[PDB]
Design a protein around this nucleic acid. Sequence first.
RNA 1: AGAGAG
Lengths: 66, 66, 66, 66, 66, 66
Amino acid sequence: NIQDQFLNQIRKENTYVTVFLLNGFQLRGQVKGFDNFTVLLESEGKQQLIYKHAISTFAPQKNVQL
Amino acid sequence: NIQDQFLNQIRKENTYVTVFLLNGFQLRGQVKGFDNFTVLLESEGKQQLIYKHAISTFAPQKNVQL
Amino acid sequence: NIQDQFLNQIRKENTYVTVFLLNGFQLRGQVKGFDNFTVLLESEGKQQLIYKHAISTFAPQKNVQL
Amino acid sequence: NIQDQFLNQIRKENTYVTVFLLNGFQLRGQVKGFDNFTVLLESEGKQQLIYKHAISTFAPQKNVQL
Amino acid sequence: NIQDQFLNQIRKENTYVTVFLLNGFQLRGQVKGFDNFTVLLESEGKQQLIYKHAISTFAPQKNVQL
Amino acid sequence: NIQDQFLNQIRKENTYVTVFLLNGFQLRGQVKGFDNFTVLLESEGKQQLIYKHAISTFAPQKNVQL
RNA sequence: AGAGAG
């Protein structure tokens, strides 16, 4: 499982991440949680629960070790 | 399971929530209930059954306790 | 199950619902049936079979009891 | 199962159908086949295999008995 | 199973096929193979692995035998 | 399985692929890993985790053997 | 957030 490798690191190394969404919107934050369906993003003040189905791409601040 | 503590908790506390849809359209209100597939939002007196497949992000009012 | 309650109640009541589609399009009419994948809507004497995957939000005209 | 009722009739009564798609495109034809994933449309000369996932709505030429 | 006789047959006969994507973009070519999730199209010398979730419609050259 | 062959072969060969996204967006880089849900792409020293649900087409630079 | 595909 890359996805889970990727995301748990980005989570415990508190990396800043841009989340690109399906529509083109770009969100920036830190991942504080994830399950099979959803990502929990700390992003500009707020806790936003993102549906994985609406995410296109994670562009990390610093590249992850996998 | 974060999705489900997120949703149940913002439901118990009538947190005011911004739901952003996949299309960009954004909706505002409170979650009356949810199941596997759908989120019942009240939106100023009014009921909207939203499919979660049409939902991108929950941005609640202040931060819940997970 | 909120979806099925919500949806059998609007079918029963013969409620006028706005169905916003994923593209923003809006239909209106009344529900005549559903299954796990589809909603049959009458909208001006015409039956339209809508897939639930293309639906965003059902906004009914009087809130529902569930 | 409405979906299958609907579609098998529209198929054996050779009804003309507009298929509205997720993007708004409108296609017109007769259903010559369907499986769980796909619809076979006779539509302006050609046999087009449509993915159900890309279909929003079937608007039949004459309303179906269900 | 229509999808699968459709695809295998247009693959055996290098039928020229218009694939319309979900976005409207349309692509033209021949199907080299397919699996559960993906259609290998050759498109003038060139290989494109397309996810079927990104595909709306197959419009082949003349009509195949199903 | 064509997808996994296709994709392990471009990962092996270190091929330059264009990945067209569902929105039309184009990325380019090379595949470093995949799982059943995601592709890890390096595109200019940066790792991007793309979901397969957001991918339309992988257009590689030299056709693949499968 | 009222529908004809590069």
